[PDB]
Amino acid sequence: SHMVEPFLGTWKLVSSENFEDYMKELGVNFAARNMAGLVKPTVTISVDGKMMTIRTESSFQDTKISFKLGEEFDETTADNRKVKSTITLENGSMIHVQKWLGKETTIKRKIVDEKMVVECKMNNIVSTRIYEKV
Ligand SMILES: CCCCCCCCCCCCCC(=O)O
């Protein structure tokens, strides 16, 4: 397994653009939007054989997912949506699709200059979050 290797590690958020409207588009209630909005999460990406784990830790939230690449799985998101998630590697990006209630959002991560640039998109609203390797 070579294609995941650049994303393996511990990443700490350092910048965020338009996260408020992305969450607004997602339906996150306004109280939760300021819990998520004023915090810098640490995201940990790891592999244990067949299995990948992506842990997100906050002051507030401490959620994580485990999955095999390209195998849909059930996920409860931090805002309590019950989604169907599929995570692939495509063109050197890691792509996470969530589908729920006939809605979809995607989270794309790519390594640029040793930083992890994460693009969150729903319905033409885009948020860009950039993490630094710890
Ligand atoms: C626990 C407080 C509620 C937070 C709700 C927003 C989370 C929904 C999806 C956020 C995905 C951010 C992805 C990332 O930057 O790694």
UniProtKB/Swiss-Prot annotation:
It is found in: Cytoplasm. Keywords: Cytoplasm, Lipid-binding, Phosphoprotein, Transport. The keyword Isomerase does not apply. This is Fatty acid-binding protein 9. GO terms for cellular component: cytosol; nucleus. SUPFAM superfamilies: Lipocalins. The keyword Transport applies. One of its GO terms (molecular function) is long-chain fatty acid binding. Coiled coil: none annotated. PROSITE patterns: FABP. It comes from Homo sapiens. CDD domains: FABP9 (cd19471). GO terms for biological process: long-chain fatty acid transport. Belongs to the calycin superfamily. Fatty-acid binding protein (FABP) family.
